[PDB]
Amino acid sequence: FLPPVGVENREPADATIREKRAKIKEMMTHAWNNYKRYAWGLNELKPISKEGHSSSLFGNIKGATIVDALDTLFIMGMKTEFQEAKSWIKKYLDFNVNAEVSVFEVNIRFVGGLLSAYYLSGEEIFRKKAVELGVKLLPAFHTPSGIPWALLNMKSGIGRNWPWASGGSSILAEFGTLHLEFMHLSHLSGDPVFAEKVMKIRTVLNKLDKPEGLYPNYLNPSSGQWGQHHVSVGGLGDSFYEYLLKAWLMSDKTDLEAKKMYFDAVQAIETHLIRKSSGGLTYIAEWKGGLLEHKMGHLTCFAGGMFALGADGAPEARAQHYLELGAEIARTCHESYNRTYVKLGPEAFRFDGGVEAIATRQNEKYYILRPEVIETYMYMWRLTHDPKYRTWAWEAVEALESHCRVNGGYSGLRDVYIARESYDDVQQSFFLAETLKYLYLIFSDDDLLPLEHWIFNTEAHPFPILR
Numbered sequence: 001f002l003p004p005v006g007v008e009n010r011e012p013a014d015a016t017i018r019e020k021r022a023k024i025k026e027m028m029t030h031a032w033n034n035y036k037r038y039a040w041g042l043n044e045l046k047p048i049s050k051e052g053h054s055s056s057l058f059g060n061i062k063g064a065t066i067v068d069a070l071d072t073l074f075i076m077g078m079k080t081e082f083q084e085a086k087s088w089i090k091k092y093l094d095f096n097v098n099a100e101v102s103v104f105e106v107n108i109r110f111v112g113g114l115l116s117a118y119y120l121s122g123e124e125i126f127r128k129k130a131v132e133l134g135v136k137l138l139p140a141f142h143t144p145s146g147i148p149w150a151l152l153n154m155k156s157g158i159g160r161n162w163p164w165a166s167g168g169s170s171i172l173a174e175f176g177t178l179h180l181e182f183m184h185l186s187h188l189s190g191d192p193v194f195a196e197k198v199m200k201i202r203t204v205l206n207k208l209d210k211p212e213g214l215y216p217n218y219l220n221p222s223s224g225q226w227g228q229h230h231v232s233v234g235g236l237g238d239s240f241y242e243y244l245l246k247a248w249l250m251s252d253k254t255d256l257e258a259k260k261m262y263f264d265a266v267q268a269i270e271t272h273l274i275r276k277s278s279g280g281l282t283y284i285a286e287w288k289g290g291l292l293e294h295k296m297g298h299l300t301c302f303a304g305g306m307f308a309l310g311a312d313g314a315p316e317a318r319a320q321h322y323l324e325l326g327a328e329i330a331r332t333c334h335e336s337y338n339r340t341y342v343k344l345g346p347e348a349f350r351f352d353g354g355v356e357a358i359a360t361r362q363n364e365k366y367y368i369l370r371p372e373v374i375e376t377y378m379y380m381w382r383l384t385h386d387p388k389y390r391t392w393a394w395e396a397v398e399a400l401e402s403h404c405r406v407n408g409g410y411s412g413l414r415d416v417y418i419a420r421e422s423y424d425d426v427q428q429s430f431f432l433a434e435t436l437k438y439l440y441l442i443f444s445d446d447d448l449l450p451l452e453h454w455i456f457n458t459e460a461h462p463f464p465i466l467r
């Protein structure tokens with residue numbers, strides 16, 4: 001174990017920034033203390049019902065919110081809370097269970113949360129548990145190609161793909177968002193097997209022709225060939241792209257394959273998917289066999305920070321281009337917040353049918369406590385220090401406090417366009433792992449989890465550079 005760099009949370013110099021940061025910590029005490037009060041040990045909290053919530057993505061594993069919150073608690077100086085969480089994990093976190101889990105979700109939340117807790121604290125239990133879980137996920141890769149199953153029974157090792165997935169195919173974002181965690185699993189366990197699995201994924205992908213430079217969201221694990229040619233930088237695709245860039249950064253820039261894959265991918269996305277509305281907003285559309293659908297998801301909004309984070313490493317005279325593209329995605333995504341009643345954006349928003357940056361379908365008007373817009377504000381603040389990004393982040397804080405904060409915690413909303421809240425009764429674990437961590441960091445100095453020394457996984461779990 002090596003002492004971690006930049007884990008001290010010194011108070012900002014400006015009194016107003018100090019006060020704003022203290023508010024975000026207070027919001028975390030509200031989310032955490034209510035989770036502990038009504039749902040301790042269960043995966044998530046139902047804040048209206050004041051009971052536990054057990055998403056099917058996690059099967060019979062326990063304590064998702066405990067594990068997802070560990071690192072946020074640590075950096076906020078919540079040491080009593082961190083110790084209670086550690087004691088529960090030592091006694092009760094068990095991966096020897098008989099149910100199916102999403103390999104992807106368990107990796108980014110449980111493996112990632114345990115890894116960050118270990119690197120921040122040095123407590124060996126976190127390392128031991130991360131490796132235990134990695135070992136349990138290894139049967140997911142038992143396919144003819146090495147492209148893993150979506151869903152794995154932890155006891156039997158038997159896997160399968162989503163039943164609706166084109167021809168029984170695996171999902172790009174799912175198998176493409178294992179890389180960072182598996183590289184650290186090999187480092188800490190000394191066992192090459194984890195890196196071998198994620199490097200085999202690379203081998204399969206690089207053998208395929210990418211239609212127009214684009215990656216279909218579906219890849220069959222038996223044949224190793226594409227399913228239907230649906231392409232998106234939001235759901236089903238998003239974090240695969242994210243992890244190409246971050247694999248390169250986290251390798252101390254030695255993973256040259258990752259770098260080329262990333263910049264090639266983003267150029268094809270710019271050409272075929274990125275458009276400007278008649279009102280002047282930049283958006284990322286979805287592509288289906290050549291035909292654009294002029295719609296962007298809240299999930300897609302993470303891409304603003306991705307583009308900005310990759311700017312420093314971009315080719316000669318392309319760095320400002322990517323900082324500016326990041327800023328335009330940030331602005332569009334801020335407009336999706338601005339044009340609502342509650343000032344929190346919808347799950348999807350459109351740029352045709354006579355609209356710009358608003359939802360039209362009733363079933364896409366919801367907000368489930370998502371971090372991706374605030375995530376992009378954090379990167380834009382740290383990479384430009386333009387005060388507007390702190391201004392926009394604080395607008396979201398005031399919105400959350402006005403419309404999502406309830407007596408029993410924080411709840412998502414079913415319709416951001418009307419006055420009367422319709423609470424969905426789920427406190428998503430990613431609100432504690434991501435939304436509040438990124439808010440806290442925005443109102444901190446740059447030297448708390450400095451971006452030069454820490455690369456965030458897709459669930460806001462910071463990992464150190466591997467040399």
Ligand SMILES: *[C@@H]1O[C@H](CO)[C@@H](O[C@@H]2O[C@H](CO)[C@@H](O[C@@H]3O[C@H](CO[C@H]4O[C@H](CO[C@H]5O[C@H](CO)[C@@H](O)[C@H](O)[C@@H]5O)[C@@H](O)[C@H](O[C@H]5O[C@H](CO)[C@@H](O)[C@H](O)[C@@H]5O)[C@@H]4O)[C@@H](O)[C@H](O[C@H]4O[C@H](CO[C@H]5O[C@H](CO)[C@@H](O)[C@H](O)[C@@H]5O)[C@@H](O)[C@H](O)[C@@H]4O)[C@@H]3O)[C@H](O)[C@H]2NC(C)=O)[C@H](O)[C@H]1NC(C)=O
Nearest residue numbers: 276277278279280281331334335336337338339340356392
């Ligand atoms: C968050 O959301 C808010 C909305 O809540 C956004 O605010 C809007 O921003 C718009 C874009 O900047 C802006 O549109 C411009 O409006 C200018 C006119 O404003 C003045 O007049 C209007 C109208 O008054 C008459 O009509 C009303 C009824 O509508 C009557 O009640 C009056 O008696 C008059 O008869 C006033 O309402 C305005 O006053 C309000 O707004 C002011 C701020 O604008 C406030 O200070 C006031 O207190 C008051 O609330 C003003 O007095 C237009 O001149 C301007 O027109 C240019 O742009 C057009 C659009 O260009 C793009 O799109 C086209 C189409 O695709 C492309 O061709 C172009 O290339 C561009 O891509 C262009 O078509 C024109 O030809 C002109 O070049 C423009 O329409 C809104 O006024 C503003 N609304 C409000 C209420 O504030 C805000 O931007 C969002 N973001 C942020 C960060 O806040």
Ligand SMILES: [Ca+2]
Nearest residue numbers: 239302458459
């Ligand atoms: Ca993410």
